[model samples]
Target: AGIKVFGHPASIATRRVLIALHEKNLDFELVHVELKDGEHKKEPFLSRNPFGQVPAFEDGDLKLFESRAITQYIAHRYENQGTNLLQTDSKNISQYAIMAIGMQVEDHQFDPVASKLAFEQIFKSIYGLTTDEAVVAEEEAKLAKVLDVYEARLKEFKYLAGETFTLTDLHHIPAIQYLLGTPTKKLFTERPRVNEWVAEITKRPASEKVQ
Candidate 1:
């Protein structure tokens, strides 16, 4: 009858949805999936997410798999509730365009590299695989290039989507949070503005609650 998120706290994708829910100030039940037991790869979880992803969101009869898409749905569905994550004002089409660009940048550019680095640096050890130094260096360099763009972009706008916090910025939370734990955090710290943005987002009540 209400919102339900099937995931575990350890999953970066799951945290993204949780952070969005907290920012939207919506109440929901968190249904933990036993990822270690291969729960996500079979049965009901597979029905929810064919890709076997950690976060499979449910809102009444609506089922959503992608974390970013779920956040978009929540932002739009409860546009009038809690924090405005979409910059929903019709008068601000320009901001919407900028937000979309930021979002796409995260998805296509930032996320691919960062997630790869996370796997090499953090998860590899967890999964009993040795960390790959060469891959880490390559990803760090790639991420550096992306952050350089972010550094310049932040100098002009308070956030990736301009002055307001949008889903674009929210999308970066899960990956950035994980990256901060790895040595690649230096990539962000080297760019002062990007570092500040990271600090600001991580300090948000919504971001902290999920942690």
Candidate 2:
């Protein structure tokens, strides 16, 4: 295949790119980079992503890193193939703005807290580290605040970036899926709108198949 993803299946960033590829109905191969073996930190993968990230994307001659950038590139490149994730049409200006805002919200607002909570509550235990309740409480509080905003926005639209499922909605999947498995899921379940939104998104074919 012309497109290749070098990453671990469990990697949140890698899963994001995979979901985007599925959404675009694009064919690609996954090249697993063993994190436990420190493969991502080595030469070949380092050459693909200088920052030494789990996911290094390749499409023909072009190479890209960072999950968000990879997803955006896929959405733009294959906009006509399947789902129109970008909303780049002139008539959809407002939708595009909202989509951009929602992506930023997911990146800056939701992810930091959600990722930290997951690391403290789940990942740490797997590696024999104690769960940090202090960090959990703090991150949970921050996540609740972010979800509060999500509740309002979701009530107004079917998806985070308007009625259509865009990159913004897909961006939340990896972190939110991790949090869903932990007690922090209540932050989502307790918010009716947010919970409904999560349910809707998770039920998508691309969403289910990716994980």
Candidate 3:
């Protein structure tokens, strides 16, 4: 099996793929792409991913970009790996509806607020720019509301996908970890159940590998 993942370990998108591989217990080579050195922009790398993104997966003849797609492919390929993170119950349309709404929350609501905070706080600091107060405040308000929803859900279900752990939990780990730094860490701590869920998933052997 010629499975190779091209990305830096610290990248949130790359972490998503790592979590999926870990959960599936699939062994694949990790090809670290040095973004700062322009490795991703070079010939061979560019051919693999024209956009020069951190994560570009190569599995034999199949090459794929985008972390979510790669994660879904990995989950589908491995039998006995785990439950279908992407699928619920086809017989019950309501299950699909639930999953769809959850996905929307993750993609639209969570990703934007989390990434903006990360960019301004983490990435901006790396470039020696001061963190902008207004942007941070706006993102924080959005994040607070999102977490309120999470707290309510976790109060009911043990995991994001009902009682069992699923791909939805895996999808959230990277962004949550990134955003839980500094002053915002208290927000997670205050929500005990939510924090525990995050801690449990993140401490898995697969997640530990990247750490």
Candidate 4:
């Protein structure tokens, strides 16, 4: 059985996988879902990806979800292919994140605020909603505070997950793209280490697929 991908093209999560396939020079059939129409919540679709999100994968008898996992799987399956990711770490990274700060901070603290700001500043007009400066200010403040934590940690290490790059760092890409070039970018650049971290991560050619 060949590879089968289930997701829509406009989704970042799905695009990540599509990029990986291109990098690996692999072929597969794409099964598009009408996420705009709530088709993802219906039968057959939910059976593929329980989370009801775009980008579910199938290979032979195996089924997989989560974009990063799928990307890593493709990398492992085609080790000889292009742009190897999740490679060895000579740093023997903690991998679990330093205490609870690494991952927990990103998800609970960073993502919430950053996503809100993205909506308020970037997508608000697209959705036919007025840009609420007060709400944007609030979310920007929250995002700045979260970046403060990153600034503090990055002052001591090279990555969000200790000194080595890990999935935790990769997970921040989508949010970072939303925040970059926006008015809130200063919050990140104001912190040098955080700034460089973003530059490094965002510079990867493979990430173009994600954008």
Candidate 5:
């Protein structure tokens, strides 16, 4: 067996692994874990990843979790492949810097605005928490500021990492995909450079392969 990725197809974390695997031209098996049915919280799955998160990687005897770490592992493991996903030089400081920014976006922007919005609007009703429109708007404003930063950055660099595309670009894609796929798509579309950058990446063969 090559590499086995344990996660659901729709999961953001799992999707990141799929993207990395496809980009590296690595052959792997996608082992679906149903979150809704609490399969991840039970035995076998929990035994592999105690946190019960999607995208637990099993490469032979090696096992890993955390989407970012998994992506880095896959990219570095196959660095000799067509695309050099990881930073390897001094000038690559910008690459890691951009990656740090992308991480900030996930924490400060994507989670609060997109993921939390979805949870409050859809999942909260199931748990009986009242979804406040005012609170959601406040969070969206914070997300908007982050998007503005992204827009400005895209205007300066072709990709997130100054000029070349790296895992930084790949890492940011899924969250951007999620945002664009939602009603908040308008926020991204308003920025020409950002919109164009996303469109260019989405058209790549690697993106098509993973999706």
Candidate 6:
């Protein structure tokens, strides 16, 4: 296998990318990155992805992270030999789906609010960190506004942009899933469209299995 995949076996993101690789007829050596052991934060692995996440894939000279980006790259790079499929049409909508909503924009808006609150609830005194109440309120207000916009936008479109799901939507799951069974679910659950959208996304066939 010319391709090498670095990821944790339990990661849904890793499993999703593996499926894309198979569909593309891509042979790869799966390099399991142990997260429970904190292996992803060490040397070599940290060198691969400075952010310290799983699934660092390498193909020839190309090295990449983020399962969504990786899958799109694999899909487009091997389309002809893969499934003879293409999702490139309506490039305008594709860009806009995430462009204005902005992957970074949505994530920054959501994660800060959710992660901080979760951390506040779990901020171990051993970690040498203290929860800032003022900061948390600011983030909640910011996230609330963003969610408000999401409620309206999603009410009109089945997905981020019109009916088809786009990269914009896929980028949401990792962080969003982090909030499940936690207090942050209320922010999303209170909004019907957002709840239904994520419910459908999490139920996709690929979402159902790892192997």
- As a TM-score, model 5 comes out at 0.84
Candidate 2 Cα deviation (angstroms), residue 193: 0.6
* Reference-based TM-score of each model: 0.95, 0.95, 0.88, 0.77, 0.84, 0.68
Residue 65 deviation, candidate 6, in Å?
A: 3.1
Query: What residue runs in model 6 are displaced by over 4 Å at the alpha carbon?
Result: 9-30, 35-38, 41-43, 50-53, 66-68, 78-101, 117-138
Candidate 1, residues 1-211: lDDT per residue as tens digits? 8999999997888998999899889999999999989999999899999999889999999999998899889888988888999875835778678788988999999989989999999889887799979988888889988999999999998898878788989999988888889888888898999999999999999998877
Clashes of 6: 0
The Cα local distance difference test for each model comes to 0.90, 0.88, 0.81, 0.75, 0.76, 0.68
Model 5 whole-model lDDT (C-alpha atoms): 0.76
Any runs in candidate 1 off by more than 4 Å, and if so which?
88-91
Q: How much is 48 displaced in model 2, in angstroms?
A: 0.7
Flag regions of model 4 displaced more than 4 Å.
15-30, 67-93, 97-101
| Candidate with more favorable, higher lDDT: 2 or 4 | 2
Q: Across residues 96-152, which tens digit of lDDT does each residue of candidate 6 receive?
A: 545445556655676566666666644433388776677767766776798888789
All-Cα superposition RMSD per candidate: 1.4, 1.4, 2.2, 3.5, 2.9, 4.7
lDDT of 4 by residue, 41-108 (tens): 98889998888988899988989998877876786787676544343442334543252355466667
The positional error of residue 206 in candidate 4, measured at the CA in angstroms, is 1.0
Return the candidate ranking by lDDT, descending: 1, 2, 3, 5, 4, 6
Among all windows of 10 consecutive residues in model 5, the one with the lowest summed lDDT is 86-95
Clashing pairs in 4: none
Best-to-worst ranking by TM-score = 2, 1, 3, 5, 4, 6
| lDDT string, candidate 5, 100-162, tens digits | 677656655665566765555555777968878886687678777877877888888777666
| Better candidate number, 1 or 4, judged by lDDT | 1
Candidate 3 ranges beyond 4 A from true positions: 82-97
